[PDB]
Amino acid sequence: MDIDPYKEFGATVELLSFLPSDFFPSVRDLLDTAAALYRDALESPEHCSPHHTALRQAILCWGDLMTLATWVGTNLEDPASRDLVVSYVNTNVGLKFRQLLWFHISCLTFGRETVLEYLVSFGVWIRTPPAARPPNAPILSTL
Amino acid sequence: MDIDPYKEFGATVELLSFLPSDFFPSVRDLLDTAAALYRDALESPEHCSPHHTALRQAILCWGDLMTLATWVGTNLEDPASRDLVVSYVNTNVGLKFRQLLWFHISCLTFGRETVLEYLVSFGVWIRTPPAARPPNAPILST
């Protein structure tokens, strides 16, 4: 099975990938925001939306990945090995969850169509050579 | 926060962890079942349902844990211990994923409300002294 967590939401991992990694806030800040804005909806007995369903699982999944990453960390004696793992995470699952959390949280905040529009827009912008390609990259906004 | 992944589905962690562990098939069996019965729905662009969405996340989460655990194994252990971290994962959180995968795959196959009454009835069964519980433990079948 090849499942792309974005696809039922109108995007793909490639679409998210156009964005530079430093575009995304830390996982810690994203989780703080999810709490501050959607905690009750997230904890309630209603589906609310497919983003909430998706988000609920991502939040818990990240708790299992940190437990595993902390465990590996304590089981490595060599500080260079630890550093290797942390870099690997940061650049792989860690960025993956930054992207995924940012996406669902932004869809909830701005609306799914607005985020998808922005991602397409940014993807064509970033990929237009410097010469052309206006000075102002696209904006993400409630309007 | 405190999120119970079953609550939007009318269940709780407890309703599940209440059944015996031996009850839940292994992760590998559930994943193969999900592919065999639902691969197309799962890889498709429609939500299909809240169970499909939840099932996709669950499957991708286990895959994230496995990718992380395998990479550590292969690249930071001697070859003979390549599976060390995978094993730690299976032992530490294997059961909790087996319940989650079994619950959505089952609600997809039998319908949620049918799964719920099976869970409720197993708990009622088991909480009855083995004398009015006709060994007919209830089963999820047909």
From Swiss-Prot, chain A:
Phosphorylated by host SRPK1, SRPK2, and maybe protein kinase C or GAPDH. Phosphorylation is critical for pregenomic RNA packaging. Protein kinase C phosphorylation is stimulated by HBx protein and may play a role in transport of the viral genome to the nucleus at the late step during the viral replication cycle. Keywords: Capsid protein, Cytoplasmic inwards viral transport, DNA-binding, Host cytoplasm, Host-virus interaction, Microtubular inwards viral transport, Phosphoprotein, Repeat, RNA-binding, T=4 icosahedral capsid protein, Viral penetration into host nucleus, Virion, Virus entry into host cell. One of its GO terms (cellular component) is host cell cytoplasm. It is found in: Virion; Host cytoplasm. Its main location: virion. Changing F97L: Enhances capsid assembly. GO terms for biological process: microtubule-dependent intracellular transport of viral material towards nucleus; symbiont entry into host cell; viral penetration into host nucleus. GO terms for molecular function: DNA binding; identical protein binding; RNA binding; structural molecule activity. Belongs to the orthohepadnavirus core antigen family. Homodimerizes, then multimerizes. Interacts with cytosol exposed regions of viral L glycoprotein present in the reticulum-to-Golgi compartment. Interacts with human FLNB. Phosphorylated form interacts with host importin alpha; this interaction depends on the exposure of the NLS, which itself depends upon genome maturation and/or phosphorylation of the capsid protein. Interacts with host NUP153. Self assembles to form an icosahedral capsid. Most capsids appear to be large particles with an icosahedral symmetry of T=4 and consist of 240 copies of capsid protein, though a fraction forms smaller T=3 particles consisting of 180 capsid proteins. Entering capsids are transported along microtubules to the nucleus. Phosphorylation of the capsid is thought to induce exposure of nuclear localization signal in the C-terminal portion of the capsid protein that allows binding to the nuclear pore complex via the importin (karyopherin-) alpha and beta. This is Capsid protein. It comes from Hepatitis B virus genotype D subtype adw (isolate United Kingdom/adyw/1979).
From Swiss-Prot, chain B:
GO terms for cellular component: host cell; host cell cytoplasm; T=4 icosahedral viral capsid. GO terms for biological process: microtubule-dependent intracellular transport of viral material towards nucleus; symbiont entry into host cell; viral penetration into host nucleus. Keywords: Capsid protein, Cytoplasmic inwards viral transport, DNA-binding, Host cytoplasm, Host-virus interaction, Microtubular inwards viral transport, Phosphoprotein, Repeat, RNA-binding, T=4 icosahedral capsid protein, Viral penetration into host nucleus, Virion, Virus entry into host cell. Disulfide bonds: none annotated. It is found in: Virion; Host cytoplasm. Self assembles to form an icosahedral capsid. Most capsids appear to be large particles with an icosahedral symmetry of T=4 and consist of 240 copies of capsid protein, though a fraction forms smaller T=3 particles consisting of 180 capsid proteins. Entering capsids are transported along microtubules to the nucleus. Phosphorylation of the capsid is thought to induce exposure of nuclear localization signal in the C-terminal portion of the capsid protein that allows binding to the nuclear pore complex via the importin (karyopherin-) alpha and beta. Homodimerizes, then multimerizes. Interacts with cytosol exposed regions of viral L glycoprotein present in the reticulum-to-Golgi compartment. Interacts with human FLNB. Phosphorylated form interacts with host importin alpha; this interaction depends on the exposure of the NLS, which itself depends upon genome maturation and/or phosphorylation of the capsid protein. Interacts with host NUP153. This is Capsid protein. It comes from Hepatitis B virus genotype D subtype adw (isolate United Kingdom/adyw/1979) (HBV-D). The lineage of its organism: Viruses, Riboviria, Pararnavirae, Artverviricota, Revtraviricetes. The chain holds residues 1 to 142 of 183 of the full protein.
